[PDB]
Scaffold this active site. Structure first.
Site, PDB file in Angstrom:
ATOM      1  N   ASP A  44      19.168   9.434  78.304  1.00 29.41           N
ATOM      2  CA  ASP A  44      19.835  10.496  79.085  1.00 29.41           C
ATOM      3  C   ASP A  44      20.504  11.640  78.302  1.00 29.41           C
ATOM      4  O   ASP A  44      20.361  12.800  78.684  1.00 29.41           O
ATOM      5  CB  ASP A  44      20.873   9.871  80.038  1.00 29.41           C
ATOM      6  CG  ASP A  44      21.259  10.805  81.168  1.00 29.41           C
ATOM      7  OD1 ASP A  44      20.373  11.186  81.953  1.00 29.41           O
ATOM      8  OD2 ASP A  44      22.444  11.172  81.279  1.00 29.41           O
ATOM      9  N   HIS A  59      20.461  17.107  77.747  1.00 27.86           N
ATOM     10  CA  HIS A  59      20.112  16.148  78.782  1.00 27.86           C
ATOM     11  C   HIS A  59      18.740  15.582  78.432  1.00 27.86           C
ATOM     12  O   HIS A  59      17.738  15.847  79.115  1.00 27.86           O
ATOM     13  CB  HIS A  59      20.102  16.875  80.140  1.00 27.86           C
ATOM     14  CG  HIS A  59      19.955  15.974  81.325  1.00 27.86           C
ATOM     15  ND1 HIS A  59      19.551  16.439  82.558  1.00 27.86           N
ATOM     16  CD2 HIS A  59      20.162  14.643  81.474  1.00 27.86           C
ATOM     17  CE1 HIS A  59      19.529  15.439  83.422  1.00 27.86           C
ATOM     18  NE2 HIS A  59      19.885  14.337  82.786  1.00 27.86           N
ATOM     19  N   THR A  81      14.016   7.924  82.007  1.00 28.52           N
ATOM     20  CA  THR A  81      14.274   6.516  81.725  1.00 28.52           C
ATOM     21  C   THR A  81      12.960   5.729  81.606  1.00 28.52           C
ATOM     22  O   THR A  81      12.857   4.849  80.764  1.00 28.52           O
ATOM     23  CB  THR A  81      15.239   5.891  82.757  1.00 28.52           C
ATOM     24  OG1 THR A  81      16.472   6.625  82.750  1.00 28.52           O
ATOM     25  CG2 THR A  81      15.525   4.429  82.418  1.00 28.52           C
ATOM     26  N   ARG A  88      27.248  12.780  92.400  1.00 27.68           N
ATOM     27  CA  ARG A  88      27.878  14.021  91.936  1.00 27.68           C
ATOM     28  C   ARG A  88      27.775  15.094  93.024  1.00 27.68           C
ATOM     29  O   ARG A  88      26.740  15.205  93.694  1.00 27.68           O
ATOM     30  CB  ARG A  88      27.197  14.553  90.667  1.00 27.68           C
ATOM     31  CG  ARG A  88      27.401  13.720  89.409  1.00 27.68           C
ATOM     32  CD  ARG A  88      26.749  14.361  88.182  1.00 27.68           C
ATOM     33  NE  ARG A  88      25.289  14.479  88.314  1.00 27.68           N
ATOM     34  CZ  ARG A  88      24.608  15.561  88.725  1.00 27.68           C
ATOM     35  NH1 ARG A  88      25.218  16.701  89.064  1.00 27.68           N
ATOM     36  NH2 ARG A  88      23.281  15.503  88.801  1.00 27.68           N
ATOM     37  N   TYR A 119      32.917   7.741  91.896  1.00 30.39           N
ATOM     38  CA  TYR A 119      31.489   7.498  91.637  1.00 30.39           C
ATOM     39  C   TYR A 119      30.951   8.165  90.368  1.00 30.39           C
ATOM     40  O   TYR A 119      31.205   9.352  90.122  1.00 30.39           O
ATOM     41  CB  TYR A 119      30.646   7.985  92.821  1.00 30.39           C
ATOM     42  CG  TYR A 119      29.215   7.479  92.781  1.00 30.39           C
ATOM     43  CD1 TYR A 119      28.212   8.181  92.097  1.00 30.39           C
ATOM     44  CD2 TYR A 119      28.866   6.289  93.412  1.00 30.39           C
ATOM     45  CE1 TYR A 119      26.905   7.703  92.049  1.00 30.39           C
ATOM     46  CE2 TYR A 119      27.561   5.807  93.378  1.00 30.39           C
ATOM     47  CZ  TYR A 119      26.585   6.510  92.695  1.00 30.39           C
ATOM     48  OH  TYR A 119      25.296   6.017  92.676  1.00 30.39           O
ATOM     49  N   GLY A 120      30.192   7.382  89.598  1.00 37.65           N
ATOM     50  CA  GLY A 120      29.306   7.855  88.522  1.00 37.65           C
ATOM     51  C   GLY A 120      29.799   9.000  87.656  1.00 37.65           C
ATOM     52  O   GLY A 120      30.836   8.881  86.984  1.00 37.65           O
ATOM     53  N   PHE A 157       3.160   6.826  83.867  1.00 35.54           N
ATOM     54  CA  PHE A 157       3.900   5.645  83.414  1.00 35.54           C
ATOM     55  C   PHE A 157       3.426   5.238  82.012  1.00 35.54           C
ATOM     56  O   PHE A 157       3.410   6.095  81.131  1.00 35.54           O
ATOM     57  CB  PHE A 157       3.855   4.537  84.480  1.00 35.54           C
ATOM     58  CG  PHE A 157       4.456   4.957  85.793  1.00 35.54           C
ATOM     59  CD1 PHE A 157       5.842   5.019  85.947  1.00 35.54           C
ATOM     60  CD2 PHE A 157       3.646   5.339  86.862  1.00 35.54           C
ATOM     61  CE1 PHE A 157       6.406   5.433  87.145  1.00 35.54           C
ATOM     62  CE2 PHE A 157       4.203   5.752  88.065  1.00 35.54           C
ATOM     63  CZ  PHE A 157       5.587   5.795  88.210  1.00 35.54           C
ATOM     64  N   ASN A 161      19.998   7.614  95.162  1.00 35.02           N
ATOM     65  CA  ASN A 161      20.632   7.727  93.838  1.00 35.02           C
ATOM     66  C   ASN A 161      21.502   6.507  93.476  1.00 35.02           C
ATOM     67  O   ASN A 161      22.492   6.647  92.752  1.00 35.02           O
ATOM     68  CB  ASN A 161      21.465   9.020  93.761  1.00 35.02           C
ATOM     69  CG  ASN A 161      21.832   9.410  92.323  1.00 35.02           C
ATOM     70  OD1 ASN A 161      20.952   9.659  91.490  1.00 35.02           O
ATOM     71  ND2 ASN A 161      23.138   9.458  92.026  1.00 35.02           N
ATOM     72  N   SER A 162      21.139   5.312  93.954  1.00 37.08           N
ATOM     73  CA  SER A 162      21.838   4.094  93.554  1.00 37.08           C
ATOM     74  C   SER A 162      21.482   3.778  92.100  1.00 37.08           C
ATOM     75  O   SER A 162      20.399   4.142  91.614  1.00 37.08           O
ATOM     76  CB  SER A 162      21.507   2.916  94.485  1.00 37.08           C
ATOM     77  OG  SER A 162      20.125   2.628  94.510  1.00 37.08           O
ATOM     78  N   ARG A 163      22.401   3.111  91.412  1.00 41.71           N
ATOM     79  CA  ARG A 163      22.346   2.993  89.958  1.00 41.71           C
ATOM     80  C   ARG A 163      22.581   1.580  89.476  1.00 41.71           C
ATOM     81  O   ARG A 163      23.269   0.793  90.128  1.00 41.71           O
ATOM     82  CB  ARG A 163      23.418   3.893  89.317  1.00 41.71           C
ATOM     83  CG  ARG A 163      23.257   5.385  89.573  1.00 41.71           C
ATOM     84  CD  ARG A 163      22.459   6.064  88.475  1.00 41.71           C
ATOM     85  NE  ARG A 163      22.083   7.439  88.820  1.00 41.71           N
ATOM     86  CZ  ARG A 163      21.421   8.275  88.015  1.00 41.71           C
ATOM     87  NH1 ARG A 163      21.064   7.909  86.786  1.00 41.71           N
ATOM     88  NH2 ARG A 163      21.119   9.497  88.440  1.00 41.71           N
ATOM     89  N   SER A 185      16.700  15.184  86.790  1.00 35.56           N
ATOM     90  CA  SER A 185      16.851  13.982  87.601  1.00 35.56           C
ATOM     91  C   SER A 185      15.617  13.784  88.488  1.00 35.56           C
ATOM     92  O   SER A 185      15.054  14.756  89.003  1.00 35.56           O
ATOM     93  CB  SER A 185      18.110  14.089  88.459  1.00 35.56           C
ATOM     94  OG  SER A 185      18.294  12.928  89.246  1.00 35.56           O
ATOM     95  N   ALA A 186      15.196  12.527  88.636  1.00 34.52           N
ATOM     96  CA  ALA A 186      14.013  12.156  89.435  1.00 34.52           C
ATOM     97  C   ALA A 186      12.664  12.521  88.803  1.00 34.52           C
ATOM     98  O   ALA A 186      11.643  12.510  89.498  1.00 34.52           O
ATOM     99  CB  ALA A 186      14.108  12.715  90.856  1.00 34.52           C
ATOM    100  N   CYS A 187      12.648  12.814  87.499  1.00 32.21           N
ATOM    101  CA  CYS A 187      11.412  13.155  86.781  1.00 32.21           C
ATOM    102  C   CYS A 187      11.093  12.213  85.614  1.00 32.21           C
ATOM    103  O   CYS A 187      10.214  12.507  84.806  1.00 32.21           O
ATOM    104  CB  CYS A 187      11.466  14.609  86.312  1.00 32.21           C
ATOM    105  SG  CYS A 187      11.689  15.765  87.674  1.00 32.21           S
ATOM    106  N   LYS A 243      28.703  12.721  82.132  1.00 34.31           N
ATOM    107  CA  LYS A 243      28.239  14.126  82.189  1.00 34.31           C
ATOM    108  C   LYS A 243      29.303  15.140  81.754  1.00 34.31           C
ATOM    109  O   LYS A 243      28.988  16.112  81.049  1.00 34.31           O
ATOM    110  CB  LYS A 243      27.799  14.492  83.609  1.00 34.31           C
ATOM    111  CG  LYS A 243      26.659  13.655  84.181  1.00 34.31           C
ATOM    112  CD  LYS A 243      25.391  13.798  83.364  1.00 34.31           C
ATOM    113  CE  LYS A 243      24.229  13.088  84.028  1.00 34.31           C
ATOM    114  NZ  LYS A 243      23.031  13.124  83.160  1.00 34.31           N
TER     115      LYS A 243
END
Ligand code: GTP
Ligand code: MN
Ligand code: MN
Ligand code: MN
Ligand code: NA
Length: 603
Positions: A302, A255, A282, A78, A226-227, A511, A394-396, A277-279, A235
């Site tokens: 998400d 979100h 998932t 994005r 992309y995405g 975790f 950010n690969s998915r 994102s990145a926290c 989104k």
């Protein structure tokens, strides 16, 4: 009349307004063919095979029906600079900042957009198929669900939308003459190609623009395959358009992961959690809990759409049908249930490939047999000692939600799941303890509004890139839930997995061990006397958290609250809200700021 160019389905079968949408844009974009998607397995498998023939995707022969797309490196995520919302007045989309640059959204006038649109879309699908994707955001015929129609010239988008939404003929039949969101997408590369095709990935970076027109109920996206830019449910609809619909209609579009947690006694609760994102949403959503007897089940990872029902329960649905999850960092130890979900029927984008047809990425934590070599996401050979990573950061992966081993039995229930706790959090290396609880709804809204995450940038409600409208009005909308008749307001918590000591190592293992924090939240919702009051909210009492098996966790550093740090924190929150929200900041948020400052001053 474009009936002659229809290669699947029929324009006569479509609802009148869906037909107008298809034909109007067929006239504009001038596609060679029109393919009305039915959502069937035959359609999907054939389209995948066709993409295989064209060099667009590679089959991963280690797995059952899994696939790999490597993109043009200019089209990898994005792009917030080229993501805009169109309204008559700027102020309805973003608050007018004092400093002159908003961090809370990006407005474009109707006039400027119309010029941009005219410079992009006319004839943009020449020589390509326009696919018509009818899709449901949420379980089919849920009262909380909403329907979209996406037009696209990308088969990658069609295949990915089949995973991430419910799409096909059943959606068209459920829709009838009802309202829908108009979603228009083009990769922006009409044939014959004017510019070179890189990595068999159609895109137009220079003209890339992702637009939202909430008053026209339209999403218009050009130039990116992309995405979040191309999968218009992900989104654009799920958060940006839906948050505005939610404001109008009395619900919330957030979100947030949704998870179900069950204690050793078999008593169950649902929680929602908003992290940036990145926290690790998932990771938490499909956690394998280390504490004996506890079970976590995933509803979504998400997006949460939430509405108080007549009984006053906050009902949440996952409007998605799959997980569009970050691949790097996903391992057997960080996320064992993700590893199991993605073994079959999964599309990977921008990850590495092993010589035996398997997937690979940074932090996968699976050593390969000697002899097994790795091809990177840039289609070149790659050794561990090389400087660049094998997969894009950010690969998915794009996998069906129904394949998750711990998918919640109510994950498709049309009424939704009853949320009893809302969790906020991000990456804070210093100052913020592992967990605390807000003192009220109004404080909890303030806590969401105050969120920051690692350079530590602000991200209120984890929605900074996604607000469909004025953030101040969004805060007011959240606060108004307290005056709704019979509303059972969930308890609000804030977490921090990422606090570090002065040598830069994590004070908390995290975790599956985060189940220990979830236990405390569960008990607090039950009314247990496990909380100690502090200036920032309730923290756990000494010995209230189960730390058995962790050895000697440095609790005093982990739960330490410093006057000096929090003084700086409140000042920085004040200045941000003053600058970025200003006249639209609700009275109650200013009041909570004043209250927190006062409690800290008395330390
Ligand atoms: N230290 C620590 N890191 C974690 C934990 N949980 C997740 N992470 C990290 O978070 C990253 C993965 O999170 P993401 O999948 O990017 O986060 P997300 O919220 O799902 O993001 P989107 O899918 O973009 O919405 C990896 O770097 C993980 O190591 C934890 O409990 N402790
Ligand atoms: Mn061809
Ligand atoms: Mn995720
Ligand atoms: Mn996300
Ligand atoms: Na490619």
């Amino acid at each position: 009349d474009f009936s002659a160019k229809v290669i699947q389905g029929s324009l006569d079968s479509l609802p009148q307004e869906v037909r107008k949408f298809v034909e109007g844009n067929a006239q504009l974009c001038q596609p060679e063919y029109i393919h009305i998607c039915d959502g069937s397995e035959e359609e999907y498998g054939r389209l995948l095979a066709h993409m295989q023939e064209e060099g667009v995707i590679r089959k991963l022969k280690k797995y059952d029906n899994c696939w790999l797309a490597l993109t043009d490196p200019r089209d990898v995520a994005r792009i917030e600079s080229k993501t805009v919302i169109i309204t008559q007045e700027q102020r309805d989309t973003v608050p007018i900042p004092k400093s002159g640059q908003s961090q809370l959204g990006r407005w474009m006038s109707e006039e400027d957009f119309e010029k941009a649109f005219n410079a992009r879309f006319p004839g943009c699908m020449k020589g390509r198929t326009m696919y018509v994707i009818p899709f449901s955001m949420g379980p089919l015929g849920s009262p909380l669900a909403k329907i979209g129609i996406e037009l696209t010239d990308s088969p990658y988008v069609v295949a990915s939308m089949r995973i991430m939404t419910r799409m096909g003929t059943s959606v068209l039949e459920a829709l009838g003459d009802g309202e829908f969101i108009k979603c228009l997408h083009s990769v922006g590369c009409p044939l014959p190609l004017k510019k070179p095709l890189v990595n068999n990935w159609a895109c137009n970076p220079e003209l890339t623009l992702i637009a939202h027109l909430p008053d026209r109920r339209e999403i218009i996206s050009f130039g990116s395959g992309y995405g979040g830019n191309s999968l218009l449910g992900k989104k654009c609809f799920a958060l940006r358009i839906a948050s505005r619909l939610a404001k109008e209609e009395g619900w919330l579009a957030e979100h947030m992961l949704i998870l179900g947690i069950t204690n050793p006694e078999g008593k169950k609760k649902y929680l929602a959690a908003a992290f940036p994102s990145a926290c690790g949403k998932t990771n938490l959503a499909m956690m394998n809990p280390t504490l004996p007897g506890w079970k976590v089940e995933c509803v979504g990872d998400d997006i949460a759409w939430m509405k108080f029902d007549a009984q006053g329960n906050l009902r949440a649905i996952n409007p998605e049908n799959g997980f569009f999850g970050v691949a790097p960092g996903t391992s057997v130890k960080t996320n064992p249930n993700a590893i199991k979900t993605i073994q079959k029927n999964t599309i990977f984008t921008n990850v590495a490939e092993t010589s035996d047809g398997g997937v690979y990425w940074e932090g996968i934590d699976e050593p390969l047999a000697p002899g097994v070599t790795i091809t990177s996401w840039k289609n070149k050979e790659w050794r561990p000692q090389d400087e660049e990573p094998c997969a894009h950061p950010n690969s998915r992966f794009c996998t069906p939600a129904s394949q998750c081993p711990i998918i919640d039995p109510a994950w498709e229930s049309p009424e939704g799941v009853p949320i009893e706790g809302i969790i906020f959090g991000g990456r804070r290396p210093a100052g913020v303890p592992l967990v605390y609880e807000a003192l009220s709804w109004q404080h909890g809204v303030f806590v969401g509004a105050a969120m920051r995450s690692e350079v530590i940038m602000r991200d209120p409600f984890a929605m900074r890139p996604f607000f469909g409208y004025n953030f101040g009005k969004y805060l007011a909308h959240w606060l108004s839930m307290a005056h709704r008749p019979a509303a059972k307001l969930p308890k609000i918590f804030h977490v921090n997995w990422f606090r570090k000591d002065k040598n830069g190592k994590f004070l908390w293992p995290g975790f599956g061990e985060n189940s220990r924090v979830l236990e405390w939240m569960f008990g607090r919702i039950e009314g247990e006397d496990s909380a100690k009051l502090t200036p920032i909210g309730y923290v756990p009492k000494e010995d209230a958290l189960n730390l058995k098996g962790l050895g000697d966790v440095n609790v005093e550093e982990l739960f330490g609250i410093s006057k000096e740090f929090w003084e700086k924190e409140v000042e920085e929150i004040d200045k941000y809200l003053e600058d970025q929200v200003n006249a639209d900041l609700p009275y109650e948020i200013e009041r909570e700021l004043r209250a927190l400052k006062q409690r800290i001053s008395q330390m």
